[PDB]
Design a protein around this ligand. Structure first.
Ligand SMILES: Cc1cc2nc3c(=O)[nH]c(=O)nc-3n(C[C@H](O)[C@H](O)[C@H](O)COP(=O)(O)O)c2cc1C
Ligand SMILES: Cc1cc2nc3c(=O)[nH]c(=O)nc-3n(C[C@H](O)[C@H](O)[C@H](O)COP(=O)(O)O)c2cc1C
Ligand SMILES: [Fe+3]
Ligand SMILES: [Fe+3]
Ligand SMILES: [Fe+3]
Ligand SMILES: [Fe+3]
Ligand SMILES: [O]
Ligand SMILES: [O]
Lengths: 400, 400
């Protein structure tokens, strides 16, 4: 194990090979980690666990650190499989150990493990737990961040905020602290995390952070359930969350599409040029949804002021990958963004209008659509380049 | 080149490496071919071409077979890129050569190539073209099979029906004739082709085949644009098309789903058991949409009497891959099929009802949904197994 601070010991699990989270909806390109902590004062407290597949390693490593019978309290900030998956394995050795968690946590913990006979202790915001030596744990309820059972645990004296998922990122490294890792790679994974997971709950992030800051509690470190431990200016990740939650957007336009014969692709490239030559301030990214990483697309959309989505008509409907991605954006609930649909068709078409409607349903302020028949000739590409001009002038953050 | 029959020479292109058709919406696991034919009587006629990427090889191989200036007529049964892609390359050497095709073909050919100065000859059903030696070509319009410009060309005397896409399949082999290849692999690719491409136009297949059979024209061979040439009982592929077009279905149920933590998967496996123990006559297939081949899924759905689609609730909506696949099935327009939605949720759910509605929009006759919270315990799995029982009894093709 690794010493986090004083009597705080990291007993989690690094996952270098992991590439798929939430099934296949979140690609972890730089691996991930599952942070579990063992506090050893007068009382011994285990905070969260690890993935189920590493349950055997978790219990064995935990034995080498401390006798399982000497563990007093178990804390579950979150009952998702990647944090409470090894719970059943552990409770088999110490079934009488009390479990501190939220009321919703009992529903989620029992929902996965089916061991309601366990000794649960429902906690709510303001509740405290003495561990001796003048130190105590303070619990803060954070429902829908990102789960109904989510909560944070604060350790007095050491000033360590166990935030679980919050302020975490999927980044695997042998070093434990934020000031010991690559800053660029760290920022990319942090932003990648919020944009794909916490975006729809942005309206709850600001008020909750304000509430926690209102407690006037000192924060020396922020120990999340994923990635590094924030010790050097740990409040920096909290500030980013404040910015990201405020309907974050840069002067950027993201264009993505699906194509069978590149007709729609040629439209996208023409649109980008029309934008770039109209507003040099705007950064432009283009992705083929079939050839690109879905999570990178969503991260840019989160950063963008507006997007253009392209699709060709296939059997009177839009292409499946485009339909699927739009369905996903509807769940993320992006705010204060604009959208414009485009694409090519053969005869009757109809996929472009279909897509435009669903983008509006997803919450985007819709501009006019751009349509073309078969492969665009020189005259058609002028219109597509013109469409980019019209979009750039409309979506301008400032004059000129 | 290879001799098909008498003065008919195959001048197409085999594609062993090809794995993606229509972008990435049709996986060609056994490669494919692009059949082009050169008829050499008193007149010389080229029927269709090949993919654009093989244009340089096509024109070069064609030169070795015949002088390009000695080619009298060019026939385009279909103006899709995989058949008329090398047209521009060829017309650059012989721009004065007449092109025979449908009225819609001119719109599609010009739409891709942008060379309207070419000498087009609009043809319609019943039109003939003399090539000498008592032989002539007969044109038959087949709109929406699968394109508005689609048509077939019949050669009298030799009794060869150039059907283009119709009765074709994506199967690459060094041997040219159907009686020279693996029959099982051939049938799989043929059924795979119709189910994924021609399903929505099934209402047009029967009447068109009836019309062609009404001409009382002899059929010795059927030369398609993809795969083998039917010479040994060539009308066998036509009979399959008659069966497949009549809202084809076996006593079979296809179950597919997407899952983040296998909760929905455990429901699917439980449902399958409940069905298998209720109706042994039914064949059952199960697929994870994230781990399976999309085209194999659609082929089974085409063969099935009904399907069960599973999804967990993710951000108040369904999983993208499931939403995307449902969008695709809506375009295929399956008929006389039944559907039942299921899936797991965390708290409020809603993805199951959402999916069930879209399945009904896709044309499926909807049965009751099956829902579960978190991971199903023993009592929950009984319900899922019970749901399979209720589905099996309802979807029974015959009593008991
Ligand atoms: C399988 C298939 C289905 C199609 N269905 C339609 C359709 O329903 N309506 C339409 O107007 N065009 C249809 N088309 C024509 C395409 O939309 C047309 O070729 C388009 O310009 C190509 O789009 P792309 O940018 O993806 O290459 C279809 C084409 C294919 C290959
Ligand atoms: C990222 C994420 C989002 C979720 N969103 C919802 C939701 O909006 N509504 C709900 O009832 N449950 C939600 N859940 C809980 C899951 O539906 C629950 O864990 C389910 O039982 C797992 O489904 P599975 O079969 O794919 O593993 C969510 C879970 C995750 C991981
Ligand atoms: Fe989580
Ligand atoms: Fe997590
Ligand atoms: Fe075609
Ligand atoms: Fe084809
Ligand atoms: O998590
Ligand atoms: O085709």
């Amino acid at each position: 194990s690794i010493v986090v601070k004083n009597n705080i010991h990291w007993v989690g699990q690094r996952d270098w090979e992991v590439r798929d989270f939430h099934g296949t909806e979140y690609k972890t390109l730089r691996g991930s980690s599952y942070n579990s902590y063992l506090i050893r004062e007068e009382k011994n407290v285990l905070i969260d666990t690890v993935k189920h597949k590493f349950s055997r390693e978790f219990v064995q490593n935990l034995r080498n650190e401390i006798d399982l019978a000497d563990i007093d309290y178990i804390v579950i900030n979150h009952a998702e499989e990647d944090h409470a998956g090894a719970l059943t394995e552990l409770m088999a050795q110490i079934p009488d150990t009390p479990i501190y968690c939220t009321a919703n946590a009992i529903d989620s913990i029992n929902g996965h493990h089916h061991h309601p006979e366990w000794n649960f202790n429902v906690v709510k915001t303001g509740d405290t737990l003495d561990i001796g030596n003048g130190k105590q744990l303070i619990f803060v309820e954070t429902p829908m961040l990102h789960w109904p059972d989510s909560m944070m645990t604060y350790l007095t004296g050491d000033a360590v905020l166990f935030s679980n998922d919050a302020f975490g990122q999927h980044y695997c490294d042998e070093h434990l602290f934020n000031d010991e890792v690559d800053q660029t790679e760290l920022f990319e994974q942090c932003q990648r995390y919020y944009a794909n997971i916490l975006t729809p709950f942005s309206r709850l992030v600001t008020p909750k952070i304000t509430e926690i800051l209102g407690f006037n509690l000192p924060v020396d470190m922020i120990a999340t359930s994923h990635g590094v431990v924030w010790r050097d200016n740990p409040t920096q990740i909290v500030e980013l969350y404040l910015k990201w939650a405020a309907d974050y957007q840069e002067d950027r336009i993201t264009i993505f599409y699906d194509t069978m014969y590149n007709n729609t692709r040629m439209m996208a490239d023409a649109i980008a040029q029309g934008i770039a030559e109209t507003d040099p301030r705007v950064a432009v990214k283009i992705f083929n949804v079939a050839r690109s990483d879905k999570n990178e697309i969503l991260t840019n959309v989160f950063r963008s002021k507006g997007v253009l989505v392209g699709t060709s008509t296939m059997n009177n409907v839009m292409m499946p990958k485009i339909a699927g991605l739009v369905e996903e954006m509807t769940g993320l609930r992006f705010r204060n963004k604009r959208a414009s649909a485009f694409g090519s068709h053969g005869w009757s078409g109809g996929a472009v209008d279909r897509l435009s409607t669903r983008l509006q349903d997803a919450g985007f302020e819709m501009s006019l659509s751009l349509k073309a028949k078969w492969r665009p000739d020189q005259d058609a590409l002028k219109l597509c380049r013109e469409h980019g001009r019209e979009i750039a002038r409309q979506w301008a953050l400032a004059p000129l």
